[PDB]
Amino acid sequence: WYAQDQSVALSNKCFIKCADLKALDGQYIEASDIYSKLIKSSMGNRLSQWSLKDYFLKKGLCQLAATDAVAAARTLQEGQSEDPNFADSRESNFLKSLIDAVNEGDSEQLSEHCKEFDNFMRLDKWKITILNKIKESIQQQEDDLL
Amino acid sequence: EVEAAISDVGGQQIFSQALLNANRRGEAKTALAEVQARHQELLKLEKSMAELTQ
């Protein structure tokens, strides 16, 4: 309804909350899609770029909770190319690092990266939940490989 | 009778080595060993100003 009224901002507040609740409920793909919409709405707006970095990160995290590491990689490449502020950001590097850990099947390396990112930028509850899910998916894959 | 047997005297050369100031001490001496504690401070500025930008 806000999007129909050209309320980009209130629309975005609602869609942040919707995407967060969907990702917490295991609906990672739809949450990633809402984050795609939110990203597309926040491109080019000087005022929202800070959310934009955050946005990219969350999208990748959902894509890592869905075990689609390729989706995380293309999201991170996309953000690096279209937003210079995201390219050089801690969030982009962290998402590179999580993708690298997921592709390697090294849950400990992921936990190390989470601790490192935590020390410089506190992981809120949502990120902790999704990151724990990603770790669990890794550990489950080794347990099957063993 | 006689001939030659030992001669020279005025003729010799010498090289020359060299030590170095002591204060030099280990490389860590001002702007070297302090960079350990100066980094924790700089990480503090980074953080406190991360609070600022957020």
Side-chain angles (χ1 to χ4, degrees):
Chain A
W1 291 343
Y2 287 127
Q4 292 175 15
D5 190 68
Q6 304 175 42
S7 195
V8 179
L10 296 176
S11 185
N12 286 0
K13 187 186 178 197
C14 303
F15 288 138
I16 293 159
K17 292 174 71 176
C18 184
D20 276 332
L21 285 179
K22 278 187 175 282
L24 291 174
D25 291 331
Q27 304 177 34
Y28 306 121
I29 302 302
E30 182 65 26
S32 166
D33 286 340
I34 298 176
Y35 285 124
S36 302
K37 295 172 186 173
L38 283 168
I39 288 162
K40 288 176 182 179
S41 72
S42 303
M43 320 315 307
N45 182 356
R46 263 270 310 290
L47 192 43
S48 49
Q49 284 179 346
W50 298 106
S51 309
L52 189 63
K53 303 182 190 203
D54 189 67
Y55 266 122
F56 278 112
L57 177 59
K58 290 197 178 178
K59 182 182 167 207
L61 290 177
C62 294
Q63 291 168 325
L64 292 180
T67 302
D68 193 347
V70 178
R74 59 88 174 173
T75 292
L76 176 65
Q77 288 174 0
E78 284 169 4
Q80 286 176 345
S81 71
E82 66 183 1
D83 179 34
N85 303 286
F86 178 73
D88 298 324
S89 74
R90 289 179 177 168
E91 295 92 329
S92 164
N93 288 317
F94 182 47
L95 179 58
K96 211 53 72 190
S97 289
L98 294 174
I99 290 158
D100 293 339
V102 168
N103 289 324
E104 183 178 1
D106 192 334
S107 65
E108 296 193 341
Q109 189 191 74
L110 182 149
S111 302
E112 293 179 353
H113 291 320
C114 291
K115 290 169 186 171
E116 290 181 328
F117 190 86
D118 188 53
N119 285 330
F120 291 111
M121 294 296 173
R122 294 295 295 167
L123 294 173
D124 63 50
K125 185 73 221 63
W126 181 97
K127 293 181 178 78
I128 293 167
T129 300
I130 302 304
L131 288 165
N132 287 339
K133 173 64 193 152
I134 297 162
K135 186 180 175 170
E136 182 46 289
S137 76
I138 299 174
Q139 293 181 310
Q140 188 274 331
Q141 290 173 11
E142 292 84 4
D143 291 331
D144 281 344
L145 289 171
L146 290 174
Chain B
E1 204 79 328
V2 239
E3 247 141 306
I6 308 137
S7 103
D8 236 29
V9 180
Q12 243 305 277
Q13 309 288 94
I14 76 170
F15 289 80
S16 163
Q17 342 183 199
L19 343 170
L20 228 127
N21 103 78
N23 289 3
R24 181 177 181 170
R25 211 50 3 217
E27 214 4 81
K29 20 117 249 95
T30 85
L32 263 129
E34 85 182 51
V35 186
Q36 177 52 236
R38 198 181 64 208
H39 182 63
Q40 289 175 50
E41 294 151 25
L42 191 159
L43 292 184
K44 179 191 22 266
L45 300 144
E46 228 169 13
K47 268 345 279 137
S48 290
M49 181 274 289
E51 173 178 8
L52 181 58
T53 188
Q54 186 63 56

Short mmCIF file of all heavy atoms in Angstrom, two decimals, chain A residues 5 8 13 28 32 39 46 82 93 104 120 125-126 129 141 145:
data_model
loop_
_atom_site.label_atom_id
_atom_site.label_comp_id
_atom_site.label_asym_id
_atom_site.label_seq_id
_atom_site.Cartn_x
_atom_site.Cartn_y
_atom_site.Cartn_z
N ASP A 5 1.38 4.35 -2.94
CA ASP A 5 1.33 5.77 -2.63
C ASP A 5 2.64 6.50 -2.93
O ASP A 5 2.74 7.71 -2.67
CB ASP A 5 0.95 5.96 -1.15
CG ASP A 5 0.63 7.41 -0.81
OD1 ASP A 5 -0.40 7.92 -1.29
OD2 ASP A 5 1.42 8.03 -0.07
N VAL A 8 8.21 5.42 -0.70
CA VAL A 8 9.36 4.52 -0.74
C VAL A 8 9.79 4.15 0.68
O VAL A 8 10.13 3.00 0.96
CB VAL A 8 10.52 5.14 -1.54
CG1 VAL A 8 11.73 4.20 -1.57
CG2 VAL A 8 10.06 5.49 -2.96
N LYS A 13 10.33 0.34 5.28
CA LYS A 13 10.30 -0.07 6.69
C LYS A 13 9.46 -1.34 6.85
O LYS A 13 9.90 -2.32 7.47
CB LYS A 13 9.75 1.09 7.53
CG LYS A 13 9.80 0.90 9.03
CD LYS A 13 9.10 2.06 9.74
CE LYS A 13 9.08 1.89 11.25
NZ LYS A 13 8.08 2.78 11.89
N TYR A 28 13.83 -18.38 3.54
CA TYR A 28 15.02 -17.62 3.15
C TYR A 28 14.91 -17.07 1.73
O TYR A 28 15.36 -15.95 1.47
CB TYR A 28 16.27 -18.50 3.30
CG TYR A 28 16.40 -19.10 4.67
CD1 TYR A 28 16.43 -20.48 4.84
CD2 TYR A 28 16.47 -18.30 5.80
CE1 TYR A 28 16.55 -21.03 6.10
CE2 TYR A 28 16.59 -18.85 7.06
CZ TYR A 28 16.63 -20.21 7.20
OH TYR A 28 16.73 -20.77 8.46
N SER A 32 15.08 -13.19 0.70
CA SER A 32 16.08 -12.68 -0.23
C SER A 32 15.43 -11.89 -1.35
O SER A 32 15.96 -10.87 -1.79
CB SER A 32 16.91 -13.84 -0.80
OG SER A 32 17.66 -13.42 -1.92
N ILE A 39 16.72 -3.45 -2.12
CA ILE A 39 17.95 -2.99 -2.75
C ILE A 39 17.61 -2.13 -3.96
O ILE A 39 18.05 -0.99 -4.07
CB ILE A 39 18.83 -4.20 -3.14
CG1 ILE A 39 19.44 -4.83 -1.89
CG2 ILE A 39 19.93 -3.80 -4.12
CD1 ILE A 39 19.95 -6.25 -2.09
N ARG A 46 21.08 8.82 -2.17
CA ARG A 46 22.18 9.15 -1.26
C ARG A 46 21.82 8.86 0.18
O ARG A 46 22.68 8.49 0.99
CB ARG A 46 22.51 10.63 -1.43
CG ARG A 46 23.68 10.95 -2.36
CD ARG A 46 25.02 10.99 -1.64
NE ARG A 46 24.98 11.83 -0.44
CZ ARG A 46 24.87 13.15 -0.43
NH1 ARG A 46 24.78 13.83 -1.57
NH2 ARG A 46 24.85 13.80 0.72
N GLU A 82 27.67 -2.43 -8.25
CA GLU A 82 26.71 -1.35 -8.40
C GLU A 82 26.80 -0.29 -7.31
O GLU A 82 26.30 0.82 -7.50
CB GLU A 82 25.27 -1.89 -8.46
CG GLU A 82 24.73 -2.56 -7.20
CD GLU A 82 23.33 -3.11 -7.43
OE1 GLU A 82 22.83 -2.99 -8.56
OE2 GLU A 82 22.74 -3.68 -6.49
N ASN A 93 33.22 -7.74 2.61
CA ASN A 93 34.32 -8.64 2.95
C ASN A 93 33.83 -9.80 3.80
O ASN A 93 34.22 -10.95 3.59
CB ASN A 93 35.41 -7.86 3.69
CG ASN A 93 36.17 -6.92 2.79
OD1 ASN A 93 36.53 -7.28 1.67
ND2 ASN A 93 36.40 -5.71 3.27
N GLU A 104 34.09 -24.17 1.33
CA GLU A 104 35.11 -25.06 1.85
C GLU A 104 34.55 -26.15 2.76
O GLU A 104 35.21 -27.18 2.94
CB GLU A 104 36.16 -24.26 2.64
CG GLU A 104 37.32 -25.10 3.18
CD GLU A 104 38.34 -24.26 3.91
OE1 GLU A 104 38.14 -23.03 4.02
OE2 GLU A 104 39.34 -24.83 4.39
N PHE A 120 34.11 -5.85 15.53
CA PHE A 120 34.15 -4.55 14.88
C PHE A 120 32.76 -3.98 14.62
O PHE A 120 32.60 -2.76 14.52
CB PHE A 120 34.92 -4.66 13.56
CG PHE A 120 36.40 -4.90 13.75
CD1 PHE A 120 36.96 -6.12 13.40
CD2 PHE A 120 37.22 -3.92 14.27
CE1 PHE A 120 38.31 -6.35 13.57
CE2 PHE A 120 38.57 -4.14 14.43
CZ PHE A 120 39.12 -5.36 14.08
N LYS A 125 20.66 -9.87 16.88
CA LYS A 125 20.09 -11.20 17.11
C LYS A 125 19.78 -11.91 15.79
O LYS A 125 20.02 -13.11 15.64
CB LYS A 125 18.83 -11.06 17.96
CG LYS A 125 18.16 -12.36 18.38
CD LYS A 125 18.98 -13.07 19.46
CE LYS A 125 19.04 -14.58 19.26
NZ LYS A 125 19.72 -14.98 18.00
N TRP A 126 19.24 -11.17 14.82
CA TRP A 126 18.83 -11.76 13.55
C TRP A 126 20.01 -12.40 12.83
O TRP A 126 19.94 -13.55 12.38
CB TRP A 126 18.19 -10.68 12.68
CG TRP A 126 17.69 -11.15 11.36
CD1 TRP A 126 16.41 -11.49 11.05
CD2 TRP A 126 18.45 -11.32 10.15
NE1 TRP A 126 16.32 -11.87 9.74
CE2 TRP A 126 17.56 -11.77 9.16
CE3 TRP A 126 19.79 -11.13 9.82
CZ2 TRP A 126 17.97 -12.04 7.86
CZ3 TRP A 126 20.20 -11.40 8.52
CH2 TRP A 126 19.29 -11.85 7.56
N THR A 129 21.10 -15.58 14.47
CA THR A 129 20.23 -16.71 14.13
C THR A 129 20.56 -17.27 12.75
O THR A 129 20.75 -18.48 12.58
CB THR A 129 18.77 -16.27 14.19
OG1 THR A 129 18.46 -15.81 15.51
CG2 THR A 129 17.84 -17.42 13.83
N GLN A 141 26.39 -31.11 6.53
CA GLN A 141 27.04 -31.65 5.34
C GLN A 141 28.30 -32.46 5.68
O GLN A 141 28.51 -33.53 5.09
CB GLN A 141 27.37 -30.54 4.34
CG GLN A 141 26.14 -29.94 3.68
CD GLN A 141 26.46 -28.73 2.82
OE1 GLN A 141 27.62 -28.44 2.54
NE2 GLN A 141 25.42 -28.05 2.36
N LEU A 145 29.08 -36.38 5.03
CA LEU A 145 30.28 -36.76 4.30
C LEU A 145 31.17 -37.71 5.09
O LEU A 145 32.17 -38.19 4.54
CB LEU A 145 31.11 -35.54 3.90
CG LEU A 145 30.60 -34.58 2.82
CD1 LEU A 145 31.48 -33.35 2.80
CD2 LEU A 145 30.53 -35.22 1.44
#
